[PDB]
Ligand SMILES: O=C(O)c1cc(-c2ccccc2)no1
């Protein structure tokens with residue numbers, strides 16, 4: 001069934017599972033036309049498919065050519081997402097296939113269920129967590145690969161860098177969600193927090209800076225302050 | 238015209254014959270129903286006065302045999318039986334017809350209601366949904382489950398309706414997932430009509446039989462099947478014009494006949510609002526839409 005805060009530790013047990021977020025699949029800019037009407041222009045998007053235990057991110061880049069000459073693009077995007085997740089599962093060896101796929105938006109349930117009929121033992125579930133995965137495109141190296149793509153492409157990342165050498169997957173996911181929530185709430189301020197000290201850098205093969213354990217405590221506290229600050233500005237508190 | 242005679246009526250019971258019903262008192266001198274129109278299937282159904290649990294009944298066709306009803310005090314119900322002795326049957330029936338111990342099937346001459354509800358229903362198809370090959374008539378009751386219900390538990394006592402499931406491999410061609418899920422025309426025309434039912438008349442017959450079992454017995458799985466067969470047509474972009482026009486007639490007379498006070502339990506709001514107002518065929522059911530809006534506007 002649904003996934004929430006009561007069964008939160010289930011994300012870090014030994015049953016393979018993937019989160020699928022479709023927020024960034026169909027992305028547009030809205031603009032005026034010469035005649036004063038409004039038009040959309042699509043830009044490249046991505047499917048965010050994440051294993052929360054290992055940090056493995058299957059980023060399928062959605063190139064704007066997939067929309068050419070198609071109708072009802074917001075509906076099509078859900079079915080394209082489900083098509084691509086199904087193709088990913090079929091490409092994985094049996095012992096790597098998930099036992100559960102958790103979708104961040106309930107509108108993905110029927111498209112994914114229909115594309116996965118051949119896998120009746122893979123559970124397709126919603127979640128009551130409000131997960132900030134839309135902010136993935138605020139991670140510079142992810143945004144760069146998506147915008148430079150000239151054709152469909154799958155790129156593999158570990159979204160936890162090397163953190164699991166030092167912390168549990170529960171703690172790593174909690175850090176990721178806090179970082180993404182901060183980037184979603186005030187992107188410029190969050191990146192300033194992450195990059196302000198030029199002596200701490202991002203390794204070529206990483207997504208985030210090489211903070212020590214104590215520096216991650218400081219960063220996490222700065223991110224929580226940013227979020228609370230923004231909540232106060234929003235609601236006049 | 239034919240006759241279903243009763244040996245006796247030892248327990249108080251409401252007796253239905255098609256869309257008609259009447260009450261018989263405990264040990265009243267009731268000996269059956271006469272003037273039953275030849276040319277249609279019929280259903281004779283029962284609800285005991287002292288225990289309204291289990292509505293039950295029998296589908297039959299007087300052209301296929303001489304049927305009489307007798308109360309079984311061991312199993313506690315009125316049973317349909319076939320009499321193979323033709324002369325005995327006529328002799329007992331005549332004695333009863335002469336002493337005016339039968340009610341008359343009360344058909345008004347202007348009235349096509351029963352034909353309109355059973356136009357596509359044939360006994361041979363009933364006997365494949367309800368499997369009891371030793372009898373020419375078919376028993377149905379309120380609690381009987383369907384094959385689909387039993388997959389999601391005595392198979393000998395089940396309603397073998399054709400399984401319809403919109404999220405099944407039968408309904409969805411590999412490679413046509415979005416197409417087939419949003420437009421059920423493949424499933425309707427190739428899988429169901431060409432493949433399983435062979436023609437629209439058999440499809441409508443099963444739809445009409447499902448409705449009648451839901452209405453007369455309160456059989457829940459029958460109601461599910463009736464709604465699924467409507468939704469399958471309405472959710473298809475490509476349906477032969479003659480089928481759409483016939484479906485409008487079929488549903489109009491079903492909605493016309495439904496007891497007003499049974500609507501909360503016999504009509505699925507989601508299915509009807511989808512079919513009348515959102516589906517491909519939302520503008521193809523003019524007669525049904527008009528009666529639904531004037532008779533059950535709350536549902537919508
Ligand atoms: O063989 C029997 O037990 C039998 C036949 C009948 C019957 C009664 C009324 C009319 C037609 C047939 N009742 O019992």
Ligand SMILES: O=C(O)c1cc(-c2ccccc2)no1
Nearest residue numbers: 324325326328329330332333
């Ligand atoms: O066996 C027959 O042929 C028979 C029995 C009856 C009968 C009818 C009414 C009351 C009692 C018996 N009529 O014919």
